[PDB]
Design a protein around this ligand. Structure first.
Ligand code: ZMR
Ligand code: ZMR
Ligand code: CL
Ligand code: CL
Lengths: 468, 469
């Protein structure tokens, strides 16, 4: 039925670091690859357990269906500002990942947020700063220089150009080479390292990127063993009005049927400048139809949505209860895509797309038989004995506690009928990620603490249909 | 040295329409063409004197340097919604024009605001509605259908397409043929007129455009005698964050020197969704380098502007005094572009661009010797006996009264030295447009009323260098 928990990422105790000098881990993503391998992804939080600071994007691999796991592999870990007054806020931040595999190329993607040095989503400015500039059909990332108003650009070879279009003696590391790509954004003049473009305080170089929220992507073509340098996918998908744009962490999908088969779907959510985190968080997907080469934004669930009288839009809404945030995405056999969205109604909110994730139907469906206490969830499609189901896992409540694995039957019209609700973990329970394993068996990687563990320890369990 | 006022567009009196059935005129634009022709543009307000309603874009032409003027020529006048409960707010709106001629092609452009039926800039919604959709690289205007969430599109030949991209039996008049193009936007099912996509109340067709602020353009290739159908230029220039985008009315320029010579510059201004008309009004220019065929937005004066030791952006600002609204644009002989902007400081605010209107220098210069009572102004470059000057006209104050023509020497470093401040019209004085007429003479079309004349009557005067100095 259900196995006992195996601890995959171990957090420290009583506010102290673990044996690796790491305080805690958060944000599980569980990928079951084509070769049977399980990739377990996490935020690795070295210094403290906040939503910022020194966080690396890390994975572990199990080649025996989750029994034993290899050593941590670091995808990305940007170097700290060695001059920051407060190291707790003195690192450029990567935070929250989504994992997915392309089933044709077998390429594995990790998509995650990036912010310059500071407090991440909780450090965002009230004012927009332009991040990119289009010059002769090429999009360049902008750099700002203290006491100068104009936009410098990073062009060919990482060479920095003046606002007026002339090459400088300065250059950015745009092809990072150090372990964990900790050299990305390093600012040189000739062969002299001066600082880093992601540093925002006590700078030793003249240049910095726009203070904003970014989305990065790294990929692996060797079953998660090694990873590419980070690719900045922001300018492909972030609209000029968006404040925050970030992933809904967990595991993305690839569409298996319909006109859009082969489409990679990555849950994301945005905020606007009208109400930001107070009334605007809005879920959507970004997608790629060319096996991860180019990315596009779908429309938000909240775009032209009717809410208590009146239409809203994600770019202009200010409605706490109509927010939807981190989400988990599933495709049905009839071609429909369901988006299970974290929200503030107390129960499960589901949006439906008829066109492979680009637009959403007018109604958000509420399922009062599945509680949602305002915490991430994960959901996967499953076939059992020729019958179509959805498995969804989240906290049972009243707080981030008592982990549940809910089983739904999907009807021919895509309506969901909730059959079973199975507690899987007493005590602390938060973020979780599900995968199908290959028999009637399923794996879950989740957040949980016991015995004074720092939030969180990430643990793994297998269950089967008899548990379900 | 200063002629008596000649009335060009005459308002009615005591809230009554004039002889032509028109309550009032507003928003002068004066343009001296290649031919020597003077074109005077205006908002023609049929129903009342507010910032919405039934408003036509109209011109008159003078062929004798402002002495006599011909009959009204209507550029654009969208038909009213015949089913609207309140006629004063029952018409799609055009409002505020900029005129400019391309010196090479001789083409004359009128660029002006458009809004569907309602209260114009004072009727904008709190929530965005997407207005355009790119389908396989092609940009189409969206239509919304009663009882449906999805975006229909207006495609080739005006054919309305479903959200899934199927042709319907519905069609939009995209190539209007009626006088003043009053049929633009008409919605047909095959051969039967059903209603109009610009109507927002008591609709008789199923379809309507996004509720938004738009920018339209019409052009003349025959010295202002006839005009093209309106071009919707909005998607070329309006960003996904902009709430209002509209012209700073008057007369635009064509750059006459430097690497961007030939560039057409059109003052505009935006608001955002953070503070709209309370704290985000921000000047910039849109420009064309291909003789008016395609248009691009410059950056706002307020983009990356330091205010109170902190950087703002036009898209996110909320600062009353940092706003800059309608503006007038002038190029210096050194290549620099000056933007004189209506503002809330009580005095004249000027921005400088060194890249042909695309970005603006960090410091907005203020001149305490020219008052700004928060009203439109016009300014023009001029040369007198080998020396460079700018002439600017606006109200002297305290209110919108006491028209002034100000004269500045432009110094070698681009600094302006204000030399003379000459009264040109006592009593009411508001919007105005200046043009150099040649041989030391200048013309001005301006808003003024007397004895119970509805706001406003548009009058013309000519003056010479002697009046200036
Ligand atoms: C980018 C970011 O800050 N991600 C946050 C997330 C976020 O703050 C909320 O969704 C905003 O409403 O909340 C939570 C949470 O547990 O509620 C965890 C993530 N924390 C970490 N990955 N450390
Ligand atoms: C599009 C529009 O509403 N244009 C308005 C303009 C505008 O309301 C302000 O600049 C907003 O701050 O103000 C004025 C004005 O006299 O202050 C006249 C124009 N009115 C007419 N053309 N009727
Ligand atoms: Cl630095
Ligand atoms: Cl209609």
């Amino acid at each position: 039925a259900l196995t006992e928990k195996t601890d995959i990422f171990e957090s420290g105790r009583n506010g102290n670091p673990n044996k690796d000098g790491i305080k805690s881990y958060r944000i599980p993503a569980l990928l079951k690859t084509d070769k049977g391998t399980l990739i377990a992804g996490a935020d690795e939080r070295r210094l403290h357990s906040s939503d910022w600071g020194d966080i690396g994007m890390v994975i572990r691999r199990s080649e025996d269906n989750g029994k034993t796991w290899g050593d941590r592999v670091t995808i990305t870990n940007l170097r700290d500002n060695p001059k920051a007054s407060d190291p707790s806020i003195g690192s450029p931040v990567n935070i929250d990942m989504v994992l997915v595999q392309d089933p044709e190329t077998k390429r594995i993607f990790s998509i995650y947020d990036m912010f310059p040095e500071g407090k991440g989503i909780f450090g965002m400015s009230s004012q927009k700063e332009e991040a990119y500039k289009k010059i002769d059909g090429k999009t360049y990332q902008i750099l700002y220089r203290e006491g100068e108003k104009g936009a410098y650009t990073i062009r060919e070879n990482g060479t920095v150009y003046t606002p007026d279009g002339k090459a400088t003696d300065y250059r950015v590391v745009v092809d990072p080479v150090k372990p964990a790509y900790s050299d990305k954004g390093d600012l040189y003049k000739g062969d002299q390292l001066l600082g880093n473009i992601y540093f925002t305080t006590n700078k030793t170089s003249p240049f910095r990127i726009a203070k904003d929220s970014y989305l990065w992507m790294s990929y692996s073509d060797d079953d998660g063993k090694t990873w590419s340098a980070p690719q900045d996918i922001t300018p492909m998908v972030k609209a000029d009005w968006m404040k925050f744009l970030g992933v809904g962490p967990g595991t993305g999908i690839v569409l298996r049927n319909g006109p859009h088969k082969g489409r990679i779907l990555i849950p994301v959510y945005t905020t606007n400048n009208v109400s930001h985190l107070d009334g605007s968080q809005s879920s959507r997907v970004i997608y790629s139809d060319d096996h991860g080469k180019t990315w596009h934004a779908g429309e938000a669930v909240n775009d032209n949505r009717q809410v208590d009288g009146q239409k809203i839009h994600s770019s202009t809404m200010n409605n706490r209860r109509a927010q939807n945030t981190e989400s988990t995405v599933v495709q049905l056999n009839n071609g429909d895509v369901k988006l299970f969205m974290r929200g503030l109604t107390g129960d499960l909110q589901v949006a439906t797309s008829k066109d492979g994730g680009v637009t959403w139907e007018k109604d958000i469906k509420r399922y009062p038989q599945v509680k949602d206490v305002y915490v991430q969830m994960s959901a996967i499609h499953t076939m059992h004995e020729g019958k179509e189901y959805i498995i969804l896992s989240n906290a049972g409540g009243p707080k981030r506690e008592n982990g549940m694995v809910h089983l739904a039957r999907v009807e021919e019209n895509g309506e969901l009928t909730w059959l079973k609700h199975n507690p899987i973990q007493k005590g602390e329970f938060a973020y979780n990620s599900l995968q199908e394993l290959g028999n009637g068996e399923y794996g879950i990687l989740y957040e949980h603490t016991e015995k004074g563990q720092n939030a969180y320890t990430l643990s793994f369990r297998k269950f089967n249909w008899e548990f379900l």
